[PDB]
Structures are given as C-alpha cells and as structure tokens.
Amino acid sequence: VNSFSGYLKLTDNVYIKNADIVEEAKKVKPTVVVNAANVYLKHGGGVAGALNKATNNAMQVESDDYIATNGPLKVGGSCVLSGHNLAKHCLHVVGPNVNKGEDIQLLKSAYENFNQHEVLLAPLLSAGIFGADPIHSLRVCVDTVRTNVYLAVFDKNLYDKLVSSFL
Numbered sequence: 001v002n003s004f005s006g007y008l009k010l011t012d013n014v015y016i017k018n019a020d021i022v023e024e025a026k027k028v029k030p031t032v033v034v035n036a037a038n039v040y041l042k043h044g045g046g047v048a049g050a051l052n053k054a055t056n057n058a059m060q061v062e063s064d065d066y067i068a069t070n071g072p073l074k075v076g077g078s079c080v081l082s083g084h085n086l087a088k089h090c091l092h093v094v095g096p097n098v099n100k101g102e103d104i105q106l107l108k109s110a111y112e113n114f115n116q117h118e119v120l121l122a123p124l125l126s127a128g129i130f131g132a133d134p135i136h137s138l139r140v141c142v143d144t145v146r147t148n149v150y151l152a153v154f155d156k157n158l159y160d161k162l163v164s165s166f167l
C-alpha cells in the first residue's frame with residue numbers, strides 16, 4: 001500500500017491523475033519525483049520551471065553545481081539529485097524535445113530510467129513544451145516502465161482525452 005490517492009488505474013503498474021505535480025509532490029512527499037529536464041538542467045519553464053520555483057531555486061543551484069562537475073546529460077538520460085522540499089529524490093529525465101528536432105525513438109530510452117526506481121511520481125515525458133504527442137508518451141510509458149508509476153497530468157482537458165483514448 002502507498003500514499004497516492006485519487007489515481008485512475010491504467011495497467012498493473014501505471015496510474016494517472018489530473019493534478020499539479022508540484023501540489024502532488026508537496027502532499028505525498030514521494031521517494032522519487034521525476035523532473036522533465038533538459039540536458040543542461042536549466043529549469044526555466046514547463047514542469048521543470050514549476051518544480052524549481054517550488055524549491056525556491058534550490059533545485060537550480062544544485063543542478064548548476066552538477067553540470068559544472070559532470071557536464072550535460074544525454075537526451076534519453078537522467079541523474080538523481082535531491083528532492084528538496086518536494087520528495088526524497090528528484091530523478092531528472094531528459095526526454096527528446098520535438099521543438100529542437102530530437103529523435104522521438106529516444107522517448108523509450110528516457111522512460112527506461114524509471115525502471116531503476118520501485119515507485120515514482122512523474123509527468124508524461126516529452127509532453128507539454130517538449131512538443132511530443134502526450135497520447136504517444138503515455139503508450140511508451142505503459143510499454144516501457146515496469147515499476148510503479150503515478151502520472152500527474154496538469155491539464156484536465158488532456159487528462160480526459162488520455163483516459164478516453166487509452167487502449
């Protein structure tokens with residue numbers, strides 16, 4: 001049993017809810033929250049900007065030190081950093097950004113990072129300002145992630161379309 005409430009069950013391991021991931025993280029304090037990161041960990045907008053704002057920029061400060069030591073992530077890759085006030089850990093995952101012309105086949109590689117964690121609170125990778133089709137992102141998630149994933153979808157209209165169209 002876990003703390004996640006109000007989520008619709010899609011499969012054995014994947015759950016979904018219309019929720020603000022920031023507000024959900026603040027309530028649950030999950031072991032892992034996933035950030036929709038870019039390779040530079042520049043948390044300007046979208047999910048990343050919202051998570052970073054909720055940490056009072058401490059996420060960005062930590063991320064800048066990580067990049068100064070390690071250099072940029074790979075598209076499809078990830079790193080584990082602090083969850084600050086939101087979670088124990090933040091898994092920063094880089095899905096491909098269609099608005100930069102990145103290979104959508106890298107979305108499966110991005111979701112494979114989730115399999116290193118038994119339970120996660122996450123957004124749909126490459127959705128929103130990353131430009132991918134969220135219906136596609138949900139299909140890749142279900143077909144790739146084997147650990148227990150609780151998906152927060154910010155937009156009510158999109159949430160209802162993801163559920164209604166789910167095969």
Ligand SMILES: Nc1noc2ccccc12
Nearest residue numbers: 020021022046047050154
């Ligand atoms: N709380 C938020 N502001 O912007 C966002 C974009 C995606 C998900 C959550 C937020």
